[PDB]
Ligand binder design. Structure first.
Ligand SMILES: Cc1cc2c3c(c1C)C(C)(C)CC=[N+]3c1c([nH]c(=O)[nH]c1=O)N2C[C@H](O)[C@H](O)[C@H](O)COP(=O)(O)O
Ligand SMILES: Cc1cc2c3c(c1C)C(C)(C)CC=[N+]3c1c([nH]c(=O)[nH]c1=O)N2C[C@H](O)[C@H](O)[C@H](O)COP(=O)(O)O
Ligand SMILES: Cc1cc2c3c(c1C)C(C)(C)CC=[N+]3c1c([nH]c(=O)[nH]c1=O)N2C[C@H](O)[C@H](O)[C@H](O)COP(=O)(O)O
Ligand SMILES: Cc1cc2c3c(c1C)C(C)(C)CC=[N+]3c1c([nH]c(=O)[nH]c1=O)N2C[C@H](O)[C@H](O)[C@H](O)COP(=O)(O)O
Ligand SMILES: Cc1cc2c3c(c1C)C(C)(C)CC=[N+]3c1c([nH]c(=O)[nH]c1=O)N2C[C@H](O)[C@H](O)[C@H](O)COP(=O)(O)O
Ligand SMILES: Cc1cc2c3c(c1C)C(C)(C)CC=[N+]3c1c([nH]c(=O)[nH]c1=O)N2C[C@H](O)[C@H](O)[C@H](O)COP(=O)(O)O
Ligand SMILES: Cc1cc2c3c(c1C)C(C)(C)CC=[N+]3c1c([nH]c(=O)[nH]c1=O)N2C[C@H](O)[C@H](O)[C@H](O)COP(=O)(O)O
Ligand SMILES: Cc1cc2c3c(c1C)C(C)(C)CC=[N+]3c1c([nH]c(=O)[nH]c1=O)N2C[C@H](O)[C@H](O)[C@H](O)COP(=O)(O)O
Ligand SMILES: Cc1cc2c3c(c1C)C(C)(C)CC=[N+]3c1c([nH]c(=O)[nH]c1=O)N2C[C@H](O)[C@H](O)[C@H](O)COP(=O)(O)O
Lengths: 183, 183, 183, 183, 183, 183, 183, 183, 183
C-alpha cells in the first residue's frame, strides 16, 4: 500500500496533474491531493474539467490552507510527493523555506525526511535567478522535471504528449509504469 | 535585412527547429542553418522529413564540421542565434568553451559579441550539474528556454503546441511575431 | 506607443510612484498601475491623496491579487516595469522567485523576457542579507535605484527633490526626459 | 526600562514563548507580543491555554497583520526580539527578506538596526537548504537557538526542561537571569 | 538481520543514546555500540546508569580507541550509524575528515559507502561556523537531527519527550517504528 | 533480473573492467558493455586479451559511437553503470555535460534518473582542476572510486589486488559480493 | 638537454607557434611539435608556409590523434609545454579535463606533474565564461599569455611584433632569451 | 548625433586610442577624450606624436583630474566609453570602485547607467588576480577586449594590425564600421 | 646533500612508505622518518616487517609525539616531505591546520615554506567532503597522489606495482629516478 502526495499549483498544465492522479490511482496507490488557489484559477481558464474533479479522483483532498493536514509532519508516512505542474512561486518557496501553505510545507517535509520529491517546473525562459533556485532544490534532493515536449515516441495528439510526460514523471516517484519507451 | 543562425542538435524535437526556420523565412529574414550529425540521426528516427529539407528551406546551409563558416568569426555580422532543439552536450559545450564544432563556436561567437543566443534546452530531469551549467550560460547572456508544454492558448493538436513554442522562441530573438497570446 | 508597468509597494515614498505615473502619462506612454495593500496603507499614512487617485491617472489599474492580469504572461508585450517605491519584501520576493502577487509576478516576467526592471529600493540601513539580495537582483538584470537625496541640482523644496529622483528613475526605463542635469 | 518583542510562530513549543513572556515580565521588562495565525492553531492543538492568554500577559499585543505596529520602523526603540518557537517559514522569511507580516518585518528591523534577534528554530531533521538559510541568518547577526533537550541540570519534569531552555534563550537577549547553571 | 552502529559522544543527552540502543535491540536489530571518553564523563554527571550498562545492552561494545574495529572498513557491512547525542567536536571531526577515533572513522566509512548516518547534534546557540559545518555534513549525506523539544504529541514527563525524539531518530535510520505520530 | 552498464575508457587498468564484467556475469546479472576507442588502444598495449573478448563476455556490446543505444534514454531501465577504468577525459565529460559519445551520455542518463554511477578514476597526481571536477561529480551523485592499492587482505599476486578492487567496485553498484573483507 | 612540447591550435596567429619552434630550436632545445586539424586549416588560410614545415623544423612531430605519444604520460620527462596560438576550445578542454586529443592530454600531463604550461590565448572579446575558464587554468598553474600588441620596443614591421611576443612567451617557459627589453 | 568617451591610460599601445579617436571622428561622432598622466608618459616613450595631438583631434579634451567633467554624472547623456589602451590599474580601479580620477569615475558612471564600456586590456601574462578582476568587470557589463594579434586579415604592416584591432573595438561600441572581415 | 621527511600514517599500504625510504636512501639522500601509532598498528596487521625496521633504514627516526623535532620549525632546512601512505585523517589534519602531531605539523611547515609535499592518499570511495579537502590541499600546494593500480608497465607481481608507484611518488619530490616509463 503506497501513498503519494500530488499537488497542483498555478502554472499552465493542470491536465498533467489530473492525469498523474488518475494514473497513480489506476495502479492502486492512494493519492493525497492538494490544489492551490492559483491552480483552481488556471484549471478554469485552461480546461473544462469540473471544479471538484480533483477532489473526486483523489483518495483524500486538501486545500492549500489546510496547514495541519497529516503530511505537514514528518511523523506521517508516505512514499513521495509530486508538484505537477509546479509554478516558479512554489518551487522557490520550497527552495528557500517559505513554507507558508500546505503545498510548500508538505514538500519541505518530504525533503527533510529524504523522501522523493518531483517538481514539474513549467516556466520559460528561466533566468539566472530561477536557475540558481532550481540548483539549490536539486542539492536538497528534489527531482527537477521541466515538462518538455518529447517526440521520440512519435506522438500524434495532445493526449500522446501528456501520457509520455505523465509516465516519465511517475517513474521519478519510483513507480514501475507501462508506457512506450526508447528501444 | 535581418540574418539569423539556427542550429539543430541531437535532442528530441527536430520539428521545432524546422518550424522556426520556416517562420523566420516567412517573416523575410535570412536563416543560416546548421544541423549536427546527431540531429540528422534524430530527424530520421523522429520525423519523415526529407534528409535535405533543412538545406532546402535555409538561406544557406552548413554542416557542423564547417568550422570556417562566416559566422565562426565575430567580424561577420548577424542578428542572433537559436539552437533548437538544444542537447545537453551542445549547451554544455557552449557553457564551458568546448567549441569543437561550428554550432558551439558560432554560439560562442554570438555570446562574445553580445548578440542574442536562445537555447531550447530539451532534457528532463535536470540534475544539479545541468542546472549549474545552465546558470553559467545565463550569466554569459544566453536565453535558456526549455520547450515546455503550454496549455493557456488552449491547443488542440501537436501542431498547436509546436506553433506556440516556436513563436515564443522567436520572440526571444527580438522578433515581432503574430500568435495567440495571453490576454 | 510605449507601455509601462508601474507598481507601488509598502515603503515610504508613495509620492514617487504617483509622480512617475504622471510623468510617463505626460510623455504619452500608457501606464499599467498596480498598488499593493501595504502601499495603500502607506499612502493613507503618508499623503492626503485620494485613495482612487492612482486608478484615476493610470491607463489601466490592477490590484495586487489580479494574478491573471495581462502582463502576468511573457507573451504580453510591454516596454518595462518600475517598482516605485520598492519595499524590501517585494525586492526580495522578486529576487528569490516568491512571485505570490501580481507585482512580484509581473516583475519576474519582465526579467525572464529581458525587459527593463527598475527597483526604487527604499530601506536604510541595508544589512548583509539585503545587500546579497540586491546583488542577486542586479545579476538577474534589475536596475537597483535607492531613492537617495541629491543636491547638485540645487533643490529648494521637497517637490524639487521628488522631480530629480523621478526623472532619474524614468531614464532607467530608457526614457528620454527633460530635466535639470549635471553640466 | 527595557522593552522586548516576543513573537510566537507556527512551530511546536508554544509553551516556550508563553514562558519567556512570563519570565521577562517577572523581571520587570515590557514585552510587545505577536502571535501568528499558525501559532494560534498550534496553541490550540498543543495546550489548554486560553486563546487570549498571550494578550493577557503581554504589555502590548499585536496580531501578525498589524504591519504598521510601532516596531515596524527602526526609528522605534527597543532592546531585542525573540521568536519562540520559530518555524522554518518565519526563519526563512527573515533570512531572505520576505517580510510579509509583522513578525518577519519586526525581525528584519531588529537586524538592520543591529539589535539582538534570537530565533528558537524548531525543526528536525534540518536539510541542506535549512542549514544554508540558518547560516545566512547567523551572518546577518541572528542568534540561532534550536530548543534542544538538555540534561546536565538534571531535570525531572517537562517544566524543568522548559525552564532551562527559556532561561538560556533569555540570556541570548542580554538578560541577567537566575537559573541553575553548569558549575 | 539488520545491524546498526550507535555512538555516544560528549554532549548532554546520554539517555537518548541509551534508549535508542534499547529500542533497536527491542526491534530485533543488532547494535554495535561505541562510547567516547567524554560521553562516559557525561553519563556519570548526567545519569545514575551503570558505567557498564551500554556494554550490557549492546550486541557488541567498543571503546573509541578501538580503531581496528570491524566497521572501520567499508568492506564490513552494516545498515547505518547514529551518533546520539552528537557533540560539535564529533560532528566537526566527521565533516572535515579528522577521523582520529573509532566514532569519527566509523561515521566517515558510513558516509563514503553511502549508508545512512544520523547525527543528533546537541548544541545551542549554533554560530555561523557550526552552521557551515552542518551544511557540509548535510552535503556529504548525513541526517542532521537536533534533539529539539516537541509537544504536539502532548508529552507529560521527561520520558515522553525522550521516547518521541528517540523514535524520530530511529525513523531516520530507515526503521519502521511504532509511536504516537501526527494525525 | 538486474541489468548493468559497464564502460571501459582509455585509462590504464583495462583488466579491471574485464574482470568486473566477468564477476557481474558470474552472479547472473546482464551486462551491457561499451569500450571507447582509447580503451581498445590501451587493451592492446596493456594486455594480450582478444580484441573481441569484451564483446564475447558481455550480454550486449556497443561501440562508443552507438549514441542511439537503448540506455541513451532515461526511459530505458537498468540498475546502474560503472566506468572501469575511468579516464580523466570521460569523468570530466560526464561532470560538465560534454556527452559526446555513448559512454558519457549513458552516465549522464544514469545520473539524471538517480541511478547508481561508479567511476573508477585512474590518474595520479590529481591537480586542483581534477579535484574540483570530481567534487562536482560527487555532488551530482556519482561514486568516485580511485582504484587504489590495498594490502589489508594480504594479497600475494596481481590477481589478488584486482579481485579486491573489482569486488569493492561491485559493492558500490549495490551488489552483494563474496570476497575477503576486514574483520 | 632541455626538451619542450609546442602545440599549434586553431586560432589566428599560426606564425607565432612556428617562430617559437624556430627560436627554441635555435637555442639548442628539442621541440616536440603537435598541430591540430584546425591549426592546419588556419595555417592554410593565414600563411603561405609549407603544410609540412612544422614537421620539418621540429625535433619530432605528432598529429593531434597520436594519443599514445610519449608525453601523454607523466612518466615521460620534459621541461614544459606551450600552446601557441591557443584557441578557446583547447584552453577550455585543458581547464575542464576534456582531454580528448594529444594536445589537451599533453597539457593536462604537464599540469599534473607541475611542469610549466604557457597558453597563448587568442580571442577577443573574452566573455565571463572565458574569464572564469582562464581563472581556473591559472589556479591549476598555467601561464595565461594573450598575445597582445606591444609597442614599447618601438616595432616597425609585423616581424618586430612577432619577435617581441615570441620572446616574451619563451621567457614564460623559463628560457633565457636575448631580445630588446624595457630599460 | 552620437557622443563617445575615449580614455587613454598608461599601458603600451597609445596608438590604438589615437586611431580610435580618429576613426570615430571620421564617422561623424563626437569624442570626449581623457588621457591619464601615465598615458602621456607612455605616449612620449612610445610615439613621436605631438603631446597635444589628442586634444587636437578630440571634440572636447579633459585631463584625468577634471573630476567634475560632465560625464562624471549619470544625468549627462552619452553613447558609450572605451578605454584604449587600458592598464591593469584602471581596469582594476573600475572593477572595485576605486573611482579616484575622471577615467575610472566616467567608466563607473557608464556601467551604472548600463551604457556600453569597452576595455582594451593590455597586459600579459594575466595572473589569477587579474583574471578574477576581469571576470568581475565582465559581470558588471564591461566588454573585455585584449588587443590581440590577428592575422586572418593577412596584415602586412603595423598599421594593418592597428586598423583591424581599432575596427573590432569600434564594433564593441555598437558602431557600424567598414573594414576587412572574415568571409 | 638532500634531506627528505617521510611519514607513514594509518592507511593500508605501509609497504609503500618502507620502499620509498629504501629508494631515497639508495639514491644517497637522508630520510627523516616518522610513523604514527595507527601506522604501526597497520604495519603489524599488514606485513611481517620488524616493528623497528623503519627506524633501522631511516637516517633519523621520530615518533609522532616528538612535536619538538627539528623540522617542526620552518627555520630547519629540508628538501621535501612525503606522507606514504596518507590516511584521510592526516590529509584532513594538514588541510585544515589541525596540526596536533609531528606529521601534520611537519607537513604544515613544509607547505608554509613552499617546499614540496606529496600525499599518497589511500581511500576509496572518496565522498564530496574528502574531495573538497583534497582540493583545498592542492590549492595550498600539496601533490595529491592516490596510489592507483597501474598496468602500462606490464607488472607481473605485487613488487612490480609497488616499484612503479614508489618511483612515481619519488618523482613528485623532484627526484631523478631510474624506472620503466612510458615510451
Ligand atoms: C493566473 C496565471 C498564473 C500564472 C500563469 C498563467 C496564469 C493565468 C498562465 C497559464 C496564464 C501563463 C502562465 N502561468 C504560470 C505562472 N507561474 C509560473 O511559474 N508558471 C506558469 O506557467 N503564473 C503565476 C502563478 O499562478 C502565481 O505566481 C501564483 O502566485 C503561484 O502560486 P501557487 O504556486 O501557490 O499556485
Ligand atoms: C540518438 C539520440 C540522442 C539523444 C536523444 C535521443 C536519441 C536517439 C532520443 C530522442 C532517443 C531521446 C533523447 N535524446 C536527447 C539527447 N540529448 C539531450 O540532451 N537531450 C535529448 O532529448 N540525446 C544525446 C545526443 O544526441 C548526444 O549527446 C550527442 O552527442 C549530442 O550531440 P550534438 O549536440 O552535437 O547534436
Ligand atoms: C505599514 C508600513 C510598512 C513599512 C514601512 C512603513 C509603514 C507604516 C513606514 C512608512 C512607517 C516606515 C517604513 N516602511 C517600509 C517598509 N518596508 C520597507 O522595506 N521599506 C519601508 O520604507 N514597511 C514594511 C511593508 O509595508 C511590509 O514589509 C509589507 O509586507 C510590504 O509588502 P508589499 O511589498 O507587498 O507592499
Ligand atoms: C499546523 C502545524 C504547522 C507546523 C507544525 C505542526 C502543526 C500542526 C506540528 C506541531 C503538528 C508539527 C510541526 N510543526 C512545525 C511546523 N513548522 C516548523 O518549521 N516547525 C514545526 O515544528 N509547522 C508549519 C507552520 O505552521 C507553517 O509552515 C506556517 O506557514 C508557519 O507560519 P508562521 O511562521 O507565520 O507561524
Ligand atoms: C564535560 C562536558 C562536555 C561538554 C558538555 C558538558 C560537559 C560536562 C555539559 C553536559 C556540561 C554541557 C555541555 N556539553 C556539550 C559539549 N559539547 C557539545 O557540543 N555539546 C554539549 O552539549 N561538551 C564538550 C565535549 O565533551 C568535548 O568537546 C569533547 O571533546 C567531545 O568529545 P567527543 O565527541 O569525542 O565525545
Ligand atoms: C593511449 C593512452 C592514453 C592514456 C593513458 C595511457 C595511454 C597509452 C597510458 C596507459 C599509457 C598511461 C595513461 N593513461 C591514462 C590516460 N588518461 C587518464 O586519465 N588516465 C590514464 O591512466 N590516457 C589518455 C586517454 O586515453 C585520452 O585522454 C582519451 O581521450 C580518453 O578518452 P576516453 O575516455 O573516451 O577513452
Ligand atoms: C577555421 C577558424 C577557426 C577559428 C578562427 C578562425 C578560423 C578560420 C579565424 C582565424 C578565421 C578567426 C578566428 N579564429 C579563432 C578560433 N578560435 C579561437 O578561440 N580563437 C581564434 O582566433 N577559431 C575556432 C577553432 O578553430 C575551433 O574552435 C576548433 O575546434 C579549435 O580546435 P583546436 O583547439 O583543436 O585547434
Ligand atoms: C611607465 C610605464 C607603465 C606601464 C607600462 C610601461 C611603462 C613605461 C611600458 C609601456 C614600459 C610597459 C608596460 N606597461 C603597462 C603598464 N601597465 C599595464 O597594465 N599594462 C602595460 O602595458 N604600466 C603601468 C602604469 O602606467 C601604471 O600602473 C599606472 O599607474 C597606470 O595608471 P593609469 O591607468 O591611470 O594610466
Ligand atoms: C586500524 C586501521 C585504520 C584504517 C584502515 C585500516 C585499519 C586496520 C585498514 C587497513 C584495516 C583498512 C583501512 N584503513 C584506512 C584508514 N584510514 C584511511 O583513510 N585510509 C585507510 O586505508 N584507517 C583509519 C586510521 O588508521 C585512523 O583514521 C587513524 O586515526 C589515522 O591516524 P593517522 O593518520 O595519524 O595514522
Amino acid at each position: 500500500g503506497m501513498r503519494f502526495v500530488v499537488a497542483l499549483t498555478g502554472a499552465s498544465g493542470q491536465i498533467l496533474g489530473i492525469r498523474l492522479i488518475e494514473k497513480l490511482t489506476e495502479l492502486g496507490a492512494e493519492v493525497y491531493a492538494v490544489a492551490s488557489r492559483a491552480a483552481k484559477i488556471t484549471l478554469k481558464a485552461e480546461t473544462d474539467y469540473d471544479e471538484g474533479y480533483v477532489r473526486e479522483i483523489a483518495t483524500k483532498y486538501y486545500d492549500e490552507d489546510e496547514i495541519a493536514a497529516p503530511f505537514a509532519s514528518g511523523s506521517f508516512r508516505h512514499d513521495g510527493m509530486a508538484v505537477v505542474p509546479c509554478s516558479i512561486k512554489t518551487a522557490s518557496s520550497i527552495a528557500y523555506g517559505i513554507a507558508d501553505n500546505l503545498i510548500a510545507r508538505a514538500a519541505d517535509v518530504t525533503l527533510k525526511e529524504k523522501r522523493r520529491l518531483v517538481l514539474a517546473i513549467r516556466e520559460a525562459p528561466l533566468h539566472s535567478g530561477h536557475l540558481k533556485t532550481l540548483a539549490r532544490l536539486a542539492e536538497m534532493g528534489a527531482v527537477i522535471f521541466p515538462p518538455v515536449l518529447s517526440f521520440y515516441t512519435r506522438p500524434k495528439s495532445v493526449d500522446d504528449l501528456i501520457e509520455h510526460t505523465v509516465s516519465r514523471i511517475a517513474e521519478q516517484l519510483g513507480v514501475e509504469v507501462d508506457y512506450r519507451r526508447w528501444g
